[PDB]
Amino acid sequence: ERKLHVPMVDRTPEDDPPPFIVAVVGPPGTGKTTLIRSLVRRMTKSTLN
Amino acid sequence: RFTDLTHPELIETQGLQIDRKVAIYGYLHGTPLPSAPGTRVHIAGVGDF
Amino acid sequence: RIVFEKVPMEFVKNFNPKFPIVMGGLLPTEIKFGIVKARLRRHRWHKKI
Amino acid sequence: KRAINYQILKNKGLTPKRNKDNRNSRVKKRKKYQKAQKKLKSV
Amino acid sequence: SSFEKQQIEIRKQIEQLENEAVAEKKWSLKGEVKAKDRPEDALLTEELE
Amino acid sequence: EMETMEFLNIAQHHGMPRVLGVATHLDLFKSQSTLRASKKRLKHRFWTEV
Amino acid sequence: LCSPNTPFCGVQIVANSDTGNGFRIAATGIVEEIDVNIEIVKKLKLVGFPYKIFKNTAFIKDMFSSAMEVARFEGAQIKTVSGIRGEIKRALSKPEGHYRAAFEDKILMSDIVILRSWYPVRVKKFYNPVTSLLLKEKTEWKGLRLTGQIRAAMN
RNA sequence: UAUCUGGUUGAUCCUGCCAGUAGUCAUAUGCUUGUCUCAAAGAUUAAGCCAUGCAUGUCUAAGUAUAAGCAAUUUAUACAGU
RNA sequence: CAUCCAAGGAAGGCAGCAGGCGCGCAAAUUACCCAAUCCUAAUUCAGGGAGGUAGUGACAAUAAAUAACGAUACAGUUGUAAUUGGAAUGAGUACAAUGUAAAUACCUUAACGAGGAACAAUUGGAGGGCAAGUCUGGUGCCAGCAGCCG
RNA sequence: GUCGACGUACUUCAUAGGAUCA
Numbered sequence: 001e002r003k004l005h006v007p008m009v010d011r012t013p014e015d016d017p018p019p020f021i022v023a024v025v026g027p028p029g030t031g032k033t034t035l036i037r038s039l040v041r042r043m044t045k046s047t048l049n
Numbered sequence: 050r051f052t053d054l055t056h057p058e059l060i061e062t063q064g065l066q067i068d069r070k071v072a073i074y075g076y077l078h079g080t081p082l083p084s085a086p087g088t089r090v091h092i093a094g095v096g097d098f
Numbered sequence: 099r100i101v102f103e104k105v106p107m108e109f110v111k112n113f114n115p116k117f118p119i120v121m122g123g124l125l126p127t128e129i130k131f132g133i134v135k136a137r138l139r140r141h142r143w144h145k146k147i
Numbered sequence: 148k149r150a151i152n153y154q155i156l157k158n159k160g161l162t163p164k165r166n167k168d169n170r171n172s173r174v175k176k177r178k179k180y181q182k183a184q185k186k187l188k189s190v
Numbered sequence: 191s192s193f194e195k196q197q198i199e200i201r202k203q204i205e206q207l208e209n210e211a212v213a214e215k216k217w218s219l220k221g222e223v224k225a226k227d228r229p230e231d232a233l234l235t236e237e238l239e
Numbered sequence: 240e241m242e243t244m245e246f247l248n249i250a251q252h253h254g255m256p257r258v259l260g261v262a263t264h265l266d267l268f269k270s271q272s273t274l275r276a277s278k279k280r281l282k283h284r285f286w287t288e289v
Numbered sequence: 290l291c292s293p294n295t296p297f298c299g300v301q302i303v304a305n306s307d308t309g310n311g312f313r314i315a316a317t318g319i320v321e322e323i324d325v326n327i328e329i330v331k332k333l334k335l336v337g338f339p340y341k342i343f344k345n346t347a348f349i350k351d352m353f354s355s356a357m358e359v360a361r362f363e364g365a366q367i368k369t370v371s372g373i374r375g376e377i378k379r380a381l382s383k384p385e386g387h388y389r390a391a392f393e394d395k396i397l398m399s400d401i402v403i404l405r406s407w408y409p410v411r412v413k414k415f416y417n418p419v420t421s422l423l424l425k426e427k428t429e430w431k432g433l434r435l436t437g438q439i440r441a442a443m444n
Numbered sequence: 445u446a447u448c449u450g451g452u453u454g455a456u457c458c459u460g461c462c463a464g465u466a467g468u469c470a471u472a473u474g475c476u477u478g479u480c481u482c483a484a485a486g487a488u489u490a491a492g493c494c495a496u497g498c499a500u501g502u503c504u505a506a507g508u509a510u511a512a513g514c515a516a517u518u519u520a521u522a523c524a525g526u
Numbered sequence: 527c528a529u530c531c532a533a534g535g536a537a538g539g540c541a542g543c544a545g546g547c548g549c550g551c552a553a554a555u556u557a558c559c560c561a562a563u564c565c566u567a568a569u570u571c572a573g574g575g576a577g578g579u580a581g582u583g584a585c586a587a588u589a590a591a592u593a594a595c596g597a598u599a600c601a602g603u604u605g606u607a608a609u610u611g612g613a614a615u616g617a618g619u620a621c622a623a624u625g626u627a628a629a630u631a632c633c634u635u636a637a638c639g640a641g642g643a644a645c646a647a648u649u650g651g652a653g654g655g656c657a658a659g660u661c662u663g664g665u666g667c668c669a670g671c672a673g674c675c676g
Numbered sequence: 677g678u679c680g681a682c683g684u685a686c687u688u689c690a691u692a693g694g695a696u697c698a
């Protein structure tokens with residue numbers, strides 16, 4: 001039963017989909033920027049100052 | 050990225066107050082955007098163009 | 099690349115890259131102006147009615 | 148810094164008004180029994 | 191700028207609406223109204239159910 | 240904080256997207272016990288929203 | 290306009306200067322219909338007093354300033370604060386504004402008779418799009434102020 | 445089923461009937477969740493598919509060291525410690 | 527079925543411990559250690575996701591806080607207190623010590639920790655009453671529905 | 677095809693009797 005849902009249409013293209021938008025939202029001073037730099041380094045091995 | 054295509058000569062002859070022509074670059078998302086010009090779009094915090 | 103004409107100059111002058119620029123297509127009904135009938139309730143955590 | 152208030156923190160929502168006697172069952176039963184004794188004295 | 195002109199128009203309208211909000215309501219919006227409070231034969235013009 | 244709660248309510252009404260809670264500044268805690276209690280309270284409150 | 294079922298949220302304050310400490314999400318809702326006109330209406334009550342009573346029949350004053358007004362409201366439904374229902378029968382020629390009414394039961398002098406009526410209301414066509422990106426500060430966009438704020442400002 | 449409640453008429457009793465009220469266990473789910481001891485974690489009859497890491501090595505005085513290994517040395521020019 | 531590839535070839539088996547997919551809707555940590563239990567070896571010594579330790583949705587179970595003793599006040603010897611007096615204590619914080627392989631926790635304990643004791647117990651059910659308010663019906667002033675809206 | 681038979685799952689109608697009183 002829990003598999004059932006309202007049928008809908010997904011318009012994501014089959015080929016070459018756009019990048020997923022990841023928004024780092026939070027109060028000031030929580031560490032949004034330092035999170036992005038750490039994440040970017042892991043995937044690309046280069047630090048964005 | 051954001052780019053202003055206004056010819057600087059128009060900026061000086063008429064002044065900074067003149068309306069500008071701008072080019073916006075980015076990935077498209079959601080349903081396909083029609084190719085023909087004249088499509089109405091709303092830029093959040095600016096207005097409808 | 100999308101080019102817009104008659105863009106206000108304040109957008110170009112007061113341009114902060116930190117603030118995102120979100121463009122959204124508009125369906126025909128979004129263009130029309132008129133009276134909107136809706137069901138609305140005060141947010142539960144909002145102090146005043 | 149805008150810390151969340153008590154309503155947002157506990158999120159008790161809309162609840163009925165409950166007498167303080169419900170917080171401790173021992174006190175509630177003590178009051179019930181003494182009231183019952185006062186009622187026996189009339190029976 | 192055109193945006194600035196829009197701002198003057200809007201500010202004029204905000205001044206008007208602030209003044210209207212402060213102003214004492216019309217007799218029709220006072221709830222109970224007696225013949226003395228409202229203009230004589232005010233109901234003649236108006237459409238009431 | 241209020242901003243965190245304000246965003247969630249906006250997202251909930253406009254179509255809830257994937258939400259991942261990331262807790263920082265945990266090194267500021269001085270006790271392991273109180274750190275676990277804050278994590279448990281913080282996690283359960285977060286579960287109600289998302 | 291926007292298609293039905295479109296949810297939305299409403300806020301009263303967007304400027305950082307007026308944020309304060311309270312929650313800023315003021316309203317939530319779902320648009321049900323789109324139209325070009327609406328017929329909001331408001332209750333308007335006419336308040337008068339009786340001066341001469343003949344059992345069920347009675348004469349009332351202070352509904353109306355002239356027999357012009359009574360002319361339309363003949364047969365109108367009226368009742369007292371006590372709940373005795375009545376009808377506006379006929380306008381007295383003298384004095385102006387006085388009319389004869391009949392009630393299901395005899396009314397008292399101290400009673401107040403009221404006529405229920407409905408007054409149309411109009412929606413104000415005010416539209417002030419938020420244009421934060423066009424501002425230098427981008428975080429203190431301010432538009433029409435709240436009634437409480439205006440009253441405080443003028444004292 | 446029992447007990448209790450209610451309906452069976454112009455009313456009250458005595459029968460009878462009718463309806464609701466019992467149960468732990470199991471599955472799913474909702475709201476709440478402060479302290480001490482203790483303890484388990486299956487399930488689409490899908491024994492369906494797996495990124496990544498680990499899960500099986502082992503030398504005593506007592507099988508084989510000229511490691512161009514280490515450190516001790518003339519306790520050791522066959523070796524002798526590790 | 528499926529990974530790498532210079533396309534010539536090469537490498538696969540989590541119904542082991544963690545952790546993923548199987549949906550678009552969901553649930554333990556990719557944690558520490560061999561200190562105990564025992565197992566393997568040439569062996570007292572090395573290894574052991576076997577196993578233990580801790581973390582994590584109220585699985586199933588045990589015990590058990592959220593106040594106790596008075597005075598005053600008000601009301602029909604009973605009830606009610608955002609009244610009032612000074613005594614008690616742990617939830618929590620924390621020197622320390624104990625605990626442990628190292629830690630967390632427990633048991634101890636200096637110093638803090640209580641009147642709205644806001645240090646803010648919950649989940650269900652039953653029954654009211656209020657209006658210049660709203661709707662429906664009719665052997666007048668009534669009845670039904672109901673009443674966050676006067 | 678508002679088709680027939682069967683199987684399965686449900687809905688429904690048949691409850692008042694004696695005594696006293698007015």
Ligand SMILES: Nc1nc2c(ncn2[C@@H]2O[C@H](COP(=O)(O)OP(=O)(O)OP(=O)(O)O)[C@@H](O)[C@H]2O)c(=O)[nH]1
Binds near residue numbers: 265267
């Ligand atoms: N001690 C500690 N400091 C942290 C942590 N996360 C962030 N910080 C500090 O918080 C400060 C701000 O970090 P940022 O990366 O600038 O956070 P931000 O989201 O960019 O903040 P804004 O850009 O000002 O809106 C830095 O000095 C960080 O060192 C954390 O976990 N522990």
Ligand SMILES: [Mg+2]
Binds near residue numbers: 032033034
């Ligand atoms: Mg930053």
Ligand SMILES: [Mg+2]
Binds near residue numbers: 272
């Ligand atoms: Mg604890």
Ligand SMILES: [Mg+2]
């Ligand atoms: Mg829950």
Ligand SMILES: [Mg+2]
Binds near residue numbers: 478592
């Ligand atoms: Mg408590």
Ligand SMILES: [Mg+2]
């Ligand atoms: Mg304790």
Ligand SMILES: [Mg+2]
């Ligand atoms: Mg040697």
Ligand SMILES: [Mg+2]
Binds near residue numbers: 540
């Ligand atoms: Mg596994």
Ligand SMILES: [Mg+2]
Binds near residue numbers: 568
């Ligand atoms: Mg040997």
